[PDB]
Amino acid sequence: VKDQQEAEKKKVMSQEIQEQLHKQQEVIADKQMSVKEDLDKVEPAVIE
Amino acid sequence: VKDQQEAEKKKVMSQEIQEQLHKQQEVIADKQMSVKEDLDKVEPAVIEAQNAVKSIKKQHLVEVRSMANPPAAVKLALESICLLLGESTTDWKQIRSIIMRENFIPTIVNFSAEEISDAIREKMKKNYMSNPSYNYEIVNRASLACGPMVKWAIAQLNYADMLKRVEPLRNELQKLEDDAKDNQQKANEVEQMI
């Protein structure tokens, strides 16, 4: 029972990981904006 | 497995209950201080309330019919009537206010928190002008009727203006009591469900 309960505390940690997947969505959105800016700006520097 | 997990979640509610037992320790400390204050203050009021019942009809009735009131009785009776919403300084209004048979009831009904701070300060100044009066000529032999009621009147002013020190105390006590009693009902009821 206690082994299962430690497993389910780690499942609560997995709920925290789902929160971190929401954080991943935020990260992906911000990185998409930054990479769009980088595609606008950096490529001519690479060509140069 | 799920049932045991729910039982542990209730045991987690029980852990919150240990936090509420720490809150109980805080509540007990605050209540002990408040009850020490109450033991310092209230017991003479209880004695005065009992003495008001001990007061005999004859002692008051004979002296109400008196043609001229003694100065000590006037001094100690005007302030008592200042409590009774009949603020006045004339002997006949005192007589009329005391005549009714409905005046044997509110010798105990009057409560300390109903007094206004300005009236409290007025009666403090009256005490200053009349410090040798009150309980001293009660001890002398001014009248048997005045004694209990005069000692009742000299009180209720100590309670005032330091019950306002207890007002934040009792408000914090009420908040803690409400939270802790709800949490202890949860403790008993959560214990039952677990």
Curated annotation (Swiss-Prot), chain B:
The domain of life is Eukaryota
Give me the ranges of the annotated region Stalk: 1-194
The record's subcellular location field reads: Cytoplasm, Cytoskeleton
Signal peptide coordinates:
none
State the domain notes. Answer: Dynein heavy chains probably consist of an N-terminal stem (which binds cargo and interacts with other dynein components), and the head or motor domain. The motor contains six tandemly-linked AAA domains in the head, which form a ring. A stalk-like structure (formed by two of the coiled coil domains) protrudes between AAA 4 and AAA 5 and terminates in a microtubule-binding site. A seventh domain may also contribute to this ring; it is not clear whether the N-terminus or the C-terminus forms this extra domain.
Kindly state the subunit structure of this protein. Homodimer. The cytoplasmic dynein 1 complex consists of two catalytic heavy chains (HCs) and a number of non-catalytic subunits presented by intermediate chains (ICs), light intermediate chains (LICs) and light chains (LCs); the composition seems to vary in respect to the IC, LIC and LC composition. The heavy chain homodimer serves as a scaffold for the probable homodimeric assembly of the respective non-catalytic subunits. The ICs and LICs bind directly to the HC dimer and dynein LCs assemble on the IC dimer. Interacts with DYNC1LI1; DYNC1LI1 and DYNC1LI2 bind mutually exclusive to DYNC1H1.
Which disease is noted in the annotation? Charcot-Marie-Tooth disease, axonal, type 2O: An axonal form of Charcot-Marie-Tooth disease, a disorder of the peripheral nervous system, characterized by progressive weakness and atrophy, initially of the peroneal muscles and later of the distal muscles of the arms. Charcot-Marie-Tooth disease is classified in two main groups on the basis of electrophysiologic properties and histopathology: primary peripheral demyelinating neuropathies (designated CMT1 when they are dominantly inherited) and primary peripheral axonal neuropathies (CMT2).
Q: What job does this protein perform? A: Cytoplasmic dynein 1 acts as a motor for the intracellular retrograde motility of vesicles and organelles along microtubules. Dynein has ATPase activity; the force-producing power stroke is thought to occur on release of ADP. Plays a role in mitotic spindle assembly and metaphase plate congression.
Family to which the UniProt record says this protein belongs = Belongs to the dynein heavy chain family.
The name on file for this protein is: Cytoplasmic dynein 1 heavy chain 1
Native organism taxonomy: Eukaryota, Metazoa, Chordata, Craniata, Vertebrata
Gene name, please?
DYNC1H1
Span of the full-length protein shown?
Answer: 3244 to 3437 of 4646
